[PDB]
Each structure stands twice: as C-alpha cells, then as structure tokens.
C-alpha cells in the first residue's frame, strides 16, 4: 500500500523590506532554493502573512501583495501608498506517499 | 410614422409637427472616477487627473449636508500611476463620515461597521461582490466598484442641479463652467482646478501629463491594442452602445490604463467595466462582453456564488425574505458581479443554500 | 440593606435550573448595585462562580473592576468617541492592562499593534513618506514631522486627544476656505492664530491671501485677463 | 468634628448646628431588572414580576422620544421560572431599534451589527 | 517509534425531539452505545451542531443547549422559548496511536 502523508513548513522570512521606491520584500522559490531554505518540487497550498503583524490577515492590510503557490510572495514599494511594504514572510505545505 | 412616440432615459420625443417634439425625464446626474484617475463630472466633462491627496470630490456647496471626498494615491514609479483608495462620504457637517475603503472595508465613523447596514436613513449594502452601495436620504447615492480594482460612482436627485461645487463640477447642465473655482473664474485644464479642491494644504499639486505611457513597451502597446479595440469594434458586444455612447474616451481610457497600468489586466477589465457600466446606466444591457477577457473574475468568486451579468436588485436573503428588508427599497443602475443565483439564499452563516434549508426567523429566533 | 437580595439569590438558585447561574447573576447584582452606590467590592468569588474566570475567550483575562474603556489599539491611534462614556465600573473579562486587542481580536502589547493613518495599516517601528512628510509607527502611537523661527511657532499632537487638526490642516490661502480634513495629527510650524501661511514657511493676514489661478499665483494688486475681460484678484477672489 | 463634611455619591452633608446640613447632588436613577423576575424600579421599589411578553420597561410618557422595552420568557416547566431574553430600546416613536438579545447579538433596525457601533448619538 | 492518529467521526444523529415541555434532544453516549453507535471511550474534542441547519454555530441559535466532551448534548424544551427544541447531533474526535 501507499499512502499520501502531508504536513506545512515553518515560517520563512528571508529577507527585510528596504524603504525607497524600489524596495519591497521579494520572497521567490528560487531565491528560497538559492539561500539553502528548503522548496518542495510539489505542494497543495501555502499561507503568506506579515511578519509583525501575526494577527491580521492579509487582506485586512489592504496592500498590494501578490501571493501564490507557483512563485511565492512579492510586494512592491512603489504600488502603496505611502512607497512601503511590511515585512512580510510565508510556509509551504510538503506531501509525500508512504508504504502502508 | 407621426404619431409615435419614444422616451430614452433622459428625455422622450414624440414625432409631430414634421419634427421630434422633445420633453425632458427628470435625470438624476452622475459623476463618476474612473481608472483612479479619470473623472466624468455631472455635465459630463471628462477629464485626467493626476493627483496624490484627499480632493473634494462633490459637494452642495451651499452648506455642508454631504461631502464626498475621494482620496487618489500614486501606485508606481511614475507620478501619473495612481489609484483611488478610499471614498469618505463626510456627512451632517463632518457629524458622520462613512469611509468605503478599497479592500471593501467600510468604516463608520472610522470604526468598522461590516454590511449591511441602515442608519439615520442611510443604507450601506453589496449587490454583489464588486460593488458597495452607499445610499443617504439627504440625495446622492455612492455605488463604489471594488473589483478589479476601485472606481466610484455618484448619483444625484436632479433637484441639487445648478447648486453642488467640488471636483465633479456644479451639475448645471454646462460644460464650460465646470471649472468654476472658488474664486469666480473657469480654471483652465483638469489639474489646475483639482489643485483648488485639495483637502490638505500639505499635498501636492497635480501636474499636467503629455507623455502616453503607450510609447514606452512595444509588448505593452500590442497588448492594449488588440485588447481595448474591442470597445470600438462594431461587431463587439459594446457595438449596441455605439450608438448611444461615443466610445472614444473610453477607448482612451482603456489605452492609457493598459499602458500605464502595472496589472495591464486589471486596469483592462476596469476600463471594459466602466464602459459598461457607463452604458447599463444610460439604459442598455451589454452582455457577455467577457469573450476570452477578463475571465479570471468569473472564477475567483467566492465559494457558492457565482457571476451574474445583471443584477438589478438586493441581495436575496433568507432574513430577508423572512421578515422583508429596508435594503431592497433601492433603485440603482443594474450593475454585474458575484451573487447567490435565483432560487437560493444565503443565511446568516452566508453560505448559499435554497430555500428549503434556510429558517423563518421571529423575533429575532432561528425558526427551522 | 442585603435582604431584598437575599431573597432574591434564595429564590432564583432554588428555582434555577442551572442553579449555580442564578445565583452567580443574583451575587454578581448585588455587587453592581453596590458599586453603582459608590463601594467597590474584590475578590468576591472565593471558591465560587470561578468558571466565569476560566471561560474567558483566549488572551483576555477576568478583571474585578472594569471602570472605563475598553483599551484598543485603533484608539491609541485615532482616539475613540466610544470611549468617553461614564458607566459604573462592571466587571468582567478584558484585555490586561497595557495590552491591547488588534483588528483580529487578540491581546498583544503596544509594540506589536500598527499605527492606523486614514484607516491604512502601519506597522510598528516602521518609517514611511506620505504627503511630502516623514513618519513613523512607534510602538503604536503615529509620529511625523515635516522650535521655528518665523512668527509661525511649533505644535505637537502628544499633549492634545487624538484627532486634533495639526500643522497638515494648516490655516492656509487654500484651506482657509474647505476646510481640512485629517483623521491624523501631525506636528509641526504653524501660524499664530490670526493669520494663514504662504505656504512657504511665513505667516500672512487671511485678507492679503494671493490668489492662484492656472498653475499661477498672484499677489494682492494683481490683475489678469480670461477672454475678454478682465479680472482683479481680491481677499482670495477674482 | 464640627466643619467636617462628608459626601455620598447622592448626597453631602455637613456636621454643623449639632446636626447634619445635607444637600443633593444630582443622582442618575437606575431602574434594574434582575434574576428574569425581579424588577427595581426607579423609585427602588422592589418587586418580582412573574410574566411571559415583552413589557414596556421605561418610557417617557409624554411622548414617544424613547422607549426601553424588555422581553420576560418562561424557562421552565414552572410558570415561575422566568428569563429575560432581550432589551429593545425603541426610539424615535419607533423608527430606530437596538435590540440587544441574550447571547449578546446587537440589532440594529434588526439588522446585526457588530460591536462598538456610534451613529446618530447612538 | 510511535506516531499519534487523529480523525473525525460522522454524524451521529441518534433522536428527533419531541413537541412539548418535557421533550427535546438528549444525545448522550452511554445512549449512543446502546444504539449501537461506535463511540470511543477517550476523546479530545466533540462537536454539536443543529442537525437540519448545518451552516450556523450553536451560539447563533440562541437555544440553551449544553454540550461536554465528557457527556453528550442535551437540549430541554422547556427552557427554551419557543417552547421547542431544534434538532441537533455531534462528532467525536477519536485518535489513537500507530507504529512509526
Ligand atoms: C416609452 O415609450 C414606450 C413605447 O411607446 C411605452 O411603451 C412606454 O410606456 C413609454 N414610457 C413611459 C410612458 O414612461
Ligand atoms: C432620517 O432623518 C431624519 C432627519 O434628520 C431623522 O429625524 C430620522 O431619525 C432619520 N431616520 C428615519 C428612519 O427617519
Ligand atoms: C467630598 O468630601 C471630601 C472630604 O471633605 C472632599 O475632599 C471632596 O472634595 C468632596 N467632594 C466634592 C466636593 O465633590
Ligand atoms: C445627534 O442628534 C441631533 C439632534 O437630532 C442630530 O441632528 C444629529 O444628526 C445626531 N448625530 C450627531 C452626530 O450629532
Ligand atoms: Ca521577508
Ligand atoms: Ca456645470
Ligand atoms: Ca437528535
């Protein structure tokens, strides 16, 4: 037998949004494959929030972020107002199949 | 063949006398932000702007009954990247202040108050997922687009004409005194009367743009090209509008955003929106327009709703049809988004069931 | 005088179904009334009616005596006509003191809650530009700038409530006239009372104003001509 | 000792002429309703109220500027087993409503509203 | 090694309540036993919910409905008004242990 047996990450905060128009927090799979941080080839969901901000979810911030399972988190200084992000981070979820 | 007669929104004509003998409908006016930064004032006078501050955006200037405020932030690099992000109908003075936020969130006296709701003769609800409605006794309705991105609309009870100020102008069937300012003189181009409106003497002044955001990607162009020419294309579902609406500004409208839009997508979609939106107003119903376009807002509704084109009425609710609805008592142009289909409620836990699942409710008592 | 509410807890717990909550409510009515009185009763429940501490939602803890406000971060930002209220001090489960309850509902302390501006999320320790001015999200509180030297003299937002109209909605030769609108106090020069800014850090009598038309600005005295005629700019009008 | 005054939070009086000189401060009445049955009034004369309706608790009577009402449901298999179950401030001759229920759900002109909530005065 | 297994149960809709003052929905365990309804002797969790309105929590219903992980659900039609009850049933959460 075979079954599926799956479980979430930890949370991953790579890097501290930079304050500017520029700046902003670019947490990507491959930026995450390239630090060391642990990428799943496969996943089924991932959850982003804010770092400082454990409570609020994402769209009660209000900001512009754009966060997805293929990619990953990105937000941009210049599309908010004022030119700023939080410091944001994210999990990813891990499914492997195991013997019965 | 004289004799007939027909009536258009606005106005009906009857064909006598060897000519179209023309009376007028009352018409409650419209002003409208487009694009976070277009505005089609009540005499209908389109015009850019540029801004990053709090402006008026209408307001009987007479006294102080409502205020419309509309607060437009810059969004990118450029300084002619902007985006509307909240409307704060200030009201009774300044005594109440309804704040409609661009998430959706809407503040009540800067307090978060979910939807709907109806107070002192207002009444704030979603006829669907993309559109809050403000209604007020005191004359305008506030319906605000929220998805793809945020668009305001107002509309006001024909009585107030000749008699409102602000950005959208003093609603006195004249396009050449729009830009009347407070100092008695007709401003000259969009940004030098927006610069009189500020709400903070801190902001900044809006600056007049030439440069088309088009001219920069060639990728950028194609992409706005082969998508906004659906607006003028005779074939298109918008063709119906055509003879009603010149869609040229709206075409403009869609370039410009397109191009200088980083979500080409969203700003898009808002643009065929608007356009739509626009023309269901006036009393057409465009539908379908969506053909392979702006799709990714059929799909992302949320969980037991689904599009619909027209909706034209409240929300069905199972309180609602249990013990009627204030809400419903609202006559607003038939906008689209994301609603429960007929034959379905959604409860108090809003999720969507039929009728057979959701309770009759007395005194307040969920009655299976 | 305790005997009507003995007859009272006598009656409700031997008739109360869940006895033991009738005669908690008729206990915990007799210390309201006593406290509306002007006595503040603690520590009451010794070995009684304690599942009304435990049931407490997460975060929030029991609290003997309640005698104002409800501490939340929103208002610590913006200030809070909710909380202006005179109510006799009941009790119940609240957030600890210094602590304060986020948007979500939880309880953290003041360094972790975002400063509000105009409704927008700030998070805390952070620096950001807005309207040509330099703020920053300090342990809650929203504090920007952007001690004078011309007639115009500094104001502060620290001394005065929340929402007070600071030195952004500034007495000016534009909004003199709207009205400014501001949920946020900001500190800085301003004028004294009497007078207006130029908007260039001077202080101007409110009739001398210049007005400004297309992207202009004109000095009181000054003329210009639309069309074909001939405008005069005077106290602020043409 | 006599100049000594105390005051109570409905009253002050001072020791003086060998006797107590008292005056009123101003006092807030309180009317309570306690235990489902048991009602004090303004005038705090305590009495129970046994009943199965929704009862006009306060209203100033004149007109119809306000009007508290109060709703006293039977609990149990008893008749006198009594539980309030809901306080409906009816204002403005009715045209507003806050009707605060038992499990703590506030209705605004019964619709649900979140709490805190400032309108209207309100 | 030796790793902890938790799952749902289904519904367990053991009664209809009864119009009247004396009767209601009594779903206890040691009753669900006699019935013959699988009902683990340990538990973390329990869940209850009206059985003909599955969307809305027990606290919006309003109805005094007591429900412990350790006895059951029982609702009484004479504390409530209406005199009446709704009709409700409950999951139980049964977790055990399996070999790494
Ligand atoms: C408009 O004209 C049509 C066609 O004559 C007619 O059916 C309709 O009633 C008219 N609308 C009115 C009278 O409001
Ligand atoms: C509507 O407005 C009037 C006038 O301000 C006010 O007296 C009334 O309470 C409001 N609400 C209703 C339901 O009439
Ligand atoms: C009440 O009496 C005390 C003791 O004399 C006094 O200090 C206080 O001011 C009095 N309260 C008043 C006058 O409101
Ligand atoms: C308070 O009551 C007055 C008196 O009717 C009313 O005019 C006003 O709208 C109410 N609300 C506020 C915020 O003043
Ligand atoms: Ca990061
Ligand atoms: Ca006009
Ligand atoms: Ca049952």
């Given at each position: 037998?075979?079954?599926?047996?799956?479980?979430?990450?930890?949370?991953?905060?790579?890097?501290?949004?930079?304050?500017?128009?520029?700046?902003?927090?670019?947490?990507?799979?491959?930026?995450?494959?390239?630090?060391?941080?642990?990428?799943?080839?496969?996943?089924?969901?991932?959850?982003?929030?804010?770092?400082?901000?454990?409570?609020?979810?994402?769209?009660?911030?209000?900001?512009?972020?754009?966060?997805?399972?293929?990619?990953?988190?990105?937000?941009?200084?210049?599309?908010?107002?004022?030119?700023?992000?939080?410091?944001?981070?994210?999990?990813?979820?891990?499914?492997?199949?195991?013997?019965? | 063949?004289?004799?007939?007669?027909?009536?258009?929104?606005?106005?009906?004509?009857?064909?006598?006398?060897?000519?179209?003998?023309?009376?007028?409908?009352?018409?409650?006016?419209?002003?409208?932000?487009?694009?976070?930064?277009?505005?089609?004032?009540?005499?209908?006078?389109?015009?850019?702007?540029?801004?990053?501050?709090?402006?008026?955006?209408?307001?009987?200037?007479?006294?102080?009954?409502?205020?419309?405020?509309?607060?437009?932030?810059?969004?990118?690099?450029?300084?002619?990247?902007?985006?509307?992000?909240?409307?704060?109908?200030?009201?009774?003075?300044?005594?109440?202040?309804?704040?409609?936020?661009?998430?959706?969130?809407?503040?009540?006296?800067?307090?978060?108050?979910?939807?709907?709701?109806?107070?002192?003769?207002?009444?704030?609800?979603?006829?669907?997922?993309?559109?809050?409605?403000?209604?007020?006794?005191?004359?305008?309705?506030?319906?605000?687009?929220?998805?793809?991105?945020?668009?305001?609309?107002?509309?006001?009870?024909?009585?107030?004409?000749?008699?409102?100020?602000?950005?959208?102008?003093?609603?006195?069937?004249?396009?050449?005194?729009?830009?009347?300012?407070?100092?008695?003189?007709?401003?000259?181009?969009?940004?030098?009367?927006?610069?009189?409106?500020?709400?903070?003497?801190?902001?900044?002044?809006?600056?007049?743009?030439?440069?088309?955001?088009?001219?920069?990607?060639?990728?950028?162009?194609?992409?706005?090209?082969?998508?906004?020419?659906?607006?003028?294309?005779?074939?298109?579902?918008?063709?119906?509008?055509?003879?009603?609406?010149?869609?040229?500004?709206?075409?403009?409208?869609?370039?410009?955003?397109?191009?200088?839009?980083?979500?080409?997508?969203?700003?898009?979609?808002?643009?065929?929106?608007?356009?739509?939106?626009?023309?269901?107003?006036?009393?057409?119903?465009?539908?379908?327009?969506?053909?392979?376009?702006?799709?990714?807002?059929?799909?992302?509704?949320?969980?037991?709703?689904?599009?619909?084109?027209?909706?034209?009425?409240?929300?069905?609710?199972?309180?609602?049809?249990?013990?009627?609805?204030?809400?419903?008592?609202?006559?607003?142009?038939?906008?689209?988004?994301?609603?429960?289909?007929?034959?379905?409620?959604?409860?108090?836990?809003?999720?969507?069931?039929?009728?057979?699942?959701?309770?009759?409710?007395?005194?307040?008592?969920?009655?299976? | 005088?305790?005997?009507?509410?003995?007859?009272?807890?006598?009656?409700?717990?031997?008739?109360?179904?869940?006895?033991?909550?009738?005669?908690?409510?008729?206990?915990?009515?007799?210390?309201?009334?006593?406290?509306?009185?002007?006595?503040?009763?603690?520590?009451?429940?010794?070995?009684?009616?304690?599942?009304?501490?435990?049931?407490?939602?997460?975060?929030?803890?029991?609290?003997?005596?309640?005698?104002?406000?409800?501490?939340?971060?929103?208002?610590?930002?913006?200030?809070?006509?909710?909380?202006?209220?005179?109510?006799?001090?009941?009790?119940?489960?609240?957030?600890?003191?210094?602590?304060?309850?986020?948007?979500?509902?939880?309880?953290?302390?003041?360094?972790?809650?975002?400063?509000?501006?105009?409704?927008?999320?700030?998070?805390?320790?952070?620096?950001?530009?807005?309207?040509?001015?330099?703020?920053?999200?300090?342990?809650?509180?929203?504090?920007?700038?952007?001690?004078?030297?011309?007639?115009?003299?500094?104001?502060?937002?620290?001394?005065?409530?929340?929402?007070?109209?600071?030195?952004?909605?500034?007495?000016?030769?534009?909004?003199?006239?709207?009205?400014?609108?501001?949920?946020?106090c900001v500190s800085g020069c301003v004028c004294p009372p009497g007078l207006v800014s130029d908007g260039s850090g001077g202080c101007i009598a409110e009739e001398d104003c210049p007005c400004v038309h297309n992207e202009a600005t004109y000095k009181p005295g000054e003329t210009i001509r639309v069309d074909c005629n001939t405008c005069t700019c005077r106290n602020r009008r043409?």
């Amino acid at each position: 037998c075979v079954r599926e047996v799956c479980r979430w990450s930890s949370w991953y905060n790579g890097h501290r949004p930079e304050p500017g128009l520029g700046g902003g927090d670019f947490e990507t799979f491959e930026n995450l494959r390239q630090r060391g941080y642990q990428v799943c080839p496969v996943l089924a969901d991932i959850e982003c929030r804010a770092a400082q901000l454990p409570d609020m979810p994402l769209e009660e911030l209000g900001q512009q972020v754009d966060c997805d399972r293929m990619r990953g988190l990105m937000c941009a200084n210049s599309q908010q107002s004022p030119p700023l992000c939080h410091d944001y981070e994210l999990r990813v979820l891990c499914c492997e199949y195991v013997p019965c | 063949s004289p004799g007939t007669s027909f009536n258009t929104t606005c106005s009906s004509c009857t064909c006598s006398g060897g000519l179209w003998q023309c009376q007028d409908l009352p018409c409650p006016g419209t002003c409208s932000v487009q694009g976070g930064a277009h505005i089609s004032t009540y005499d209908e006078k389109l015009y850019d702007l540029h801004g990053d501050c709090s402006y008026v955006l209408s307001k009987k200037c007479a006294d102080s009954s409502f205020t419309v405020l509309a607060e437009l932030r810059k969004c990118g690099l450029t300084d002619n990247e902007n985006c509307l992000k909240a409307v704060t109908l200030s009201l009774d003075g300044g005594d109440t202040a309804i704040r409609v936020q661009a998430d959706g969130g809407v503040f009540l006296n800067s307090i978060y108050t979910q939807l709907p709701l109806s107070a002192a003769n207002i009444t704030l609800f979603t006829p669907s997922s993309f559109f809050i409605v403000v209604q007020t006794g005191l004359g305008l309705q506030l319906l605000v687009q929220l998805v793809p991105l945020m668009q305001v609309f107002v509309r006001l009870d024909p009585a107030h004409q000749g008699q409102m100020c602000g950005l959208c102008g003093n609603f006195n069937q004249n396009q050449a005194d729009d830009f009347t300012a407070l100092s008695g003189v007709v401003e000259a181009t969009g940004a030098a009367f927006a610069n009189t409106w500020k709400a903070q003497a801190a902001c900044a002044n809006a600056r007049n743009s030439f440069e088309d955001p088009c001219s920069l990607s060639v990728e950028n162009e194609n992409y706005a090209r082969h998508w906004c020419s659906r607006l003028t294309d005779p074939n298109s579902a918008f063709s119906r509008c055509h003879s009603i609406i010149n869609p040229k500004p709206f075409h403009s409208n869609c370039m410009f955003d397109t191009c200088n839009c980083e979500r080409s997508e969203d700003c898009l979609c808002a643009a065929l929106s608007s356009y739509v939106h626009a023309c269901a107003a006036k009393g057409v119903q465009l539908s379908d327009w969506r053909d392979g376009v702006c799709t990714k807002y059929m799909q992302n509704c949320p969980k037991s709703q689904r599009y619909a084109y027209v909706v034209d009425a409240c929300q069905p609710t199972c309180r609602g049809l249990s013990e009627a609805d204030v809400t419903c008592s609202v006559s607003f142009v038939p906008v689209d988004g994301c609603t429960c289909p007929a034959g379905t409620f959604l409860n108090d836990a809003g999720a969507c069931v039929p009728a057979q699942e959701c309770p009759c409710y007395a005194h307040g008592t969920v009655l299976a | 005088n305790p005997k009507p509410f003995h007859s009272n807890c006598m009656f409700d717990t031997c008739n109360c179904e869940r006895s033991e909550d009738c005669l908690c409510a008729a206990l915990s009515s007799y210390v309201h009334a006593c406290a509306a009185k002007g006595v503040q009763l603690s520590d009451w429940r010794d070995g009684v009616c304690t599942k009304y501490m435990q049931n407490c939602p997460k975060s929030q803890r029991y609290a003997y005596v309640v005698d104002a406000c409800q501490p939340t971060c929103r208002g610590l930002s913006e200030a809070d006509v909710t909380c202006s209220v005179s109510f006799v001090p009941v009790d119940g489960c609240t957030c600890p003191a210094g602590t304060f309850l986020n948007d979500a509902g939880a309880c953290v302390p003041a360094q972790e809650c975002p400063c509000y501006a105009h409704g927008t999320v700030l998070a805390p320790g952070e620096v950001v530009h807005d309207e040509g001015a330099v703020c920053s999200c300090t342990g809650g509180k929203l504090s920007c700038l952007g001690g004078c030297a011309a007639p115009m003299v500094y104001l502060d937002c620290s001394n005065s409530s929340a929402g007070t109209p600071g030195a952004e909605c500034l007495r000016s030769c534009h909004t003199l006239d709207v009205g400014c609108f501001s949920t946020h106090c900001v500190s800085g020069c301003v004028c004294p009372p009497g007078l207006v800014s130029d908007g260039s850090g001077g202080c101007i009598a409110e009739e001398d104003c210049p007005c400004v038309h297309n992207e202009a600005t004109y000095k009181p005295g000054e003329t210009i001509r639309v069309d074909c005629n001939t405008c005069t700019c005077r106290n602020r009008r043409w």
